[PDB]
Design a protein around this ligand. Structure first.
Ligand code: S3P
Ligand code: GPJ
Length: 427
């Protein structure tokens, strides 16, 4: 078991140029692969989740080149649905953005492809998406546990009236939205009830428009899509910096700054996680917005009680920042933390208690009462990049912290610790 120990950080201050957005990166790669023409993506994220998408495109026969640092990608569009036969197996790690989107996209036309991944991915639900794709005509077989990957996709999605449950993941709807335009018939996607992680749907529609396709969004309850469309290369496209990755650095300033500025995202960003800055402001920090930056300056830090359904990923950062806030913090409406890289409600409550907090692990919320002083702990990370990054913040105190399996940050941010060190100051 590898581990790293972080020494106490007296103050943070500086500027971080963000790694590319994982969410934008994987959508842009799939759309570029489906489109006609050559797309040049810049500021693409180099991380496990994107690498699995790149490897999948390679296996499907898509041609592309990568720059030395893997952040510039020149993709030769396929000019239509991707294809492979012979039950070709695509390994997708634990990348939901790739598993869900490809599960839908590869249902176009005929194909015989198997999508699989790491053990945890075989425990992450996908039944809501499979149910919808089947209503649209797709043939899909669960090779192991019903409602979970691995899936054998044999094609047939033609369109029509499709219902989809949006209560567990917005990724199912996102997958359907990117796929439907290329189906032969028109598609009407009806949301069954609640829709979680709504801002990610806006990211999807934004990317689709960039690639030449628009649809009719009827108050996020029903989406009307015309079939027979084609995606078109946007030429050169700049991938936004990752707003979720930015959360750690902005929170670090709110706790121990100083002023920390992140570049690559700004007031015009399409990512819902830029709203994380709003939460820090509500807690007492000062936020500055620019065209291509967001900065946070230390003010004070007070506990909050908020519904975090709109920023589920960045919300984890508030759970450890809460260790430094005055009062008890409550994060609500975050049930799907349970079905992601690990069951995050169980994991965050367990590790937070190890450093001294009193924590109520609710079914779909977490209540955190900070200790008068933190203690040292060896933090388990559950193969979850964000557990490692969130707990790195414990070092902005008088105690060091040991993080197990620090390389798990590579899912979305391989260089995380060196970047945190960049803004860590001794004086
Ligand atoms: O579509 C996307 O890019 C994502 C949507 C979210 O998932 P859910 O919709 O399941 O909350 C988020 O947690 C994930 O990291 C990325
Ligand atoms: O990035 C996160 O915090 C959660 N990601 C879930 P996935 O992208 O694997 O579906």
């Amino acid at each position: 078991m590898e581990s790293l120990t972080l020494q106490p950080i007296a103050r943070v201050d500086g500027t971080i140029n963000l790694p590319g957005s994982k969410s934008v990166s994987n959508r842009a790669l799939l759309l570029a692969a489906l489109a006609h023409g050559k797309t040049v993506l810049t500021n693409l994220l180099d991380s496990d989740d994107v690498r699995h998408m790149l490897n999948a495109l390679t296996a499907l026969g898509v041609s592309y080149t990568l720059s030395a640092d893997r952040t510039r990608c020149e993709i030769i569009g396929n000019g239509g649905p991707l294809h492979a036969e012979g039950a070709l197996e695509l390994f997708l790690g634990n990348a939901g953005t790739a598993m869900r989107s490809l599960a839908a996209a590869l249902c176009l036309g005929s194909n015989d492809i198997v999508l699989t991944g790491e053990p945890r991915m075989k425990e992450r639900p996908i039944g809501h998406l499979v149910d919808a794709l089947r209503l649209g005509g797709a043939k899909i077989t669960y090779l192991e546990q019903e409602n979970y990957p691995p899936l054998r996709l044999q094609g047939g999605f033609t369109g029509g009236n499709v219902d989809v449950d949006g209560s567990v993941s917005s990724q199912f709807l996102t997958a359907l939205l990117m796929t439907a335009p290329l189906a032969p018939e028109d598609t009407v996607i009806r949301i069954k009830g609640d829709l979680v992680s709504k801002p990610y749907i806006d990211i999807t529609l934004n990317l689709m428009k960039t690639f030449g396709v628009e649809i009719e969004n009827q108050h996020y309850q029903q989406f009307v899509v015309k079939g027979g469309q084609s995606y078109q290369s946007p030429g050169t496209y700049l991938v936004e910096g990752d707003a979720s990755s930015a959360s750690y650095f902005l929170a670090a300033a709110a706790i121990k700054g100083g002023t920390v500025k992140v570049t690559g995202i700004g007031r015009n960003s399409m990512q819902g996680d830029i709203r994380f800055a709003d939460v820090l402001e509500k807690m007492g920090a000062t936020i500055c917005w620019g065209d291509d930056y967001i900065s946070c300056t230390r003010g004070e830090l007070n506990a909050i009680d908020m519904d975090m359904n709109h920023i589920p990923d960045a919300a984890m950062t508030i759970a450890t920042a809460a260790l430094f806030a005055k009062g008890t913090t409550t994060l609500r409406n975050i049930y799907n933390w349970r079905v992601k890289e690990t069951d995050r409600l169980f994991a965050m409550a367990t590790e937070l208690r190890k450093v001294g907090a009193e924590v109520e692990e609710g079914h779909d919320y977490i209540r955190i009462t900070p200790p008068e002083k933190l203690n040292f702990a060896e933090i388990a990370t559950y193969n979850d990049h964000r557990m490692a990054m969130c707990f790195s913040l414990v070092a902005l105190s008088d105690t060091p912290v040991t993080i197990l399996d620090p390389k798990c940050t590579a899912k979305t941010f391989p260089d995380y610790f060196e970047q945190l060190a960049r803004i860590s100051q001794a004086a």
